[PDB]
């Protein structure tokens, strides 16, 4: 790379995987379109497997991001609407408190307080319907925003429901494919375990568990990658316009639209939003906040800071690009660090290259 692409991540990554303790890390930028990696460290601490650009990671609620774009590709398509009720695509979801909670609202987080995890007793079809049919919403429909797997996971199952496919059918067949992200697994295939690193949470090696219905966790968080698949999916969200698939280019553009305002952060279809430049400082277990309707909703703003974090047990990610820039970063660890360390020095390595 650029000397001065080099310079300024390594001077920003080796302090922190220094401070983090962090077992390996794969870094991608994004700069003037073109992809520039960096790896360093340990996929495999106990068998001594290097970090390499082919290195499966779970990306946690990163995959928020490819649910929402996959959501987008349906609503384009004509498959569903924002605007629909969710009894639509769930009849059997018969009870009161269901009346004016649409898709939209599943998708955003402003549903009225779906609780955070779908709850680990849940197995069948049955138990999940269930859950859904008794859960009691603190408030009204589009009101207040509260971070949610049981929200944007259903979201994500309610969508693939008019192409009849699966959820990760859709995924692979409407996104994964068409964008080339050929190493990039819901189920990691027997073929690709060799490349799948280890998550380590206090020093010991994890995995996520397989994916279930009764989790939503495919939906919501289940989506391992590369760092050159991510590098690709950052120039995808960059430059949607250029994707050839008619669908999937208006998927990705509703995905990075302003739904709702709280503070400075706007709410997309699993991204997240704020107006660039961003304050670097601007951008808890449960935080409910109000949200105000963004009335219509902005089509996506070239001049945002578009970004989401994700964590699993033993990974921790961060994705963030700047449209109006062609400038993006991608960070994948096997250890949950804490959030503002990514965005520190995410926004250190962009503001430099801006």
Do not use: C
Request: proline share 7%; net charge neutral; aromatic share 10%.
């Amino acid at each position: 790379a650029p000397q001065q692409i080099n310079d300024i991540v390594h001077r920003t990554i080796t302090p922190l995987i220094e401070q983090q303790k962090i077992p390996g890390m794969a870094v991608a930028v994004i700069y003037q379109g073109k992809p520039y990696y960096f790896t360093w460290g340990y996929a495999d601490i106990a068998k001594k497997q290097p970090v390499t650009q082919q290195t499966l990671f779970e990306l946690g609620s990163v995959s928020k991001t490819f649910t929402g774009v996959l959501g987008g590709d349906a609503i384009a398509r004509g498959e569903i609407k924002l605007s629909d009720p969710t009894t639509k695509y769930w009849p059997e979801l018969t009870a009161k408190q269901w009346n004016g909670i649409t898709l939209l609202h599943l998708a955003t987080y402003t549903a009225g307080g779906l609780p955070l995890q779908v709850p680990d007793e849940v197995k069948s079809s049955s138990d999940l319907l269930r859950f859904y049919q008794n859960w009691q919403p603190a408030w009204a429909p589009g009101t207040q925003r509260l971070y949610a797997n049981s929200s944007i996971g259903l979201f994500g199952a309610l969508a693939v429901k008019p192409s009849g496919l699966s959820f990760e059918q859709a995924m692979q067949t409407r996104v994964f494919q068409p964008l080339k992200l050929n190493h990039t697994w819901i189920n990691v295939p027997p073929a690709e375990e060799k490349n799948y690193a280890w998550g380590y949470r206090e020093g010991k090696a994890v995995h996520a568990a397989a994916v279930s219905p009764g989790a939503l966790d495919a939906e919501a968080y289940g989506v391992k990658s590369t760092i050159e698949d991510m590098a690709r999916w950052v120039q995808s969200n960059l430059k949607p316009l250029d994707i050839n698939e008619k669908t999937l280019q208006q998927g990705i553009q509703l995905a990075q639209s302003r739904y709702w305002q709280t503070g400075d952060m706007y709410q997309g279809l699993g991204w997240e939003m704020l107006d660039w430049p961003v304050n670097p400082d601007s951008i808890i277990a449960l935080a409910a906040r109000p949200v105000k309707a963004i009335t219509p909703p902005t089509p996506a703003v070239r001049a945002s800071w578009v970004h989401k974090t994700g964590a699993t047990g033993g990974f921790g990610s961060y994705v963030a690009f700047i449209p109006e820039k062609e400038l993006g970063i991608v960070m994948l660890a096997n250890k949950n660090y804490p959030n503002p360390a990514r965005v520190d020095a995410a926004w250190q390595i962009l503001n430099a290259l801006q």
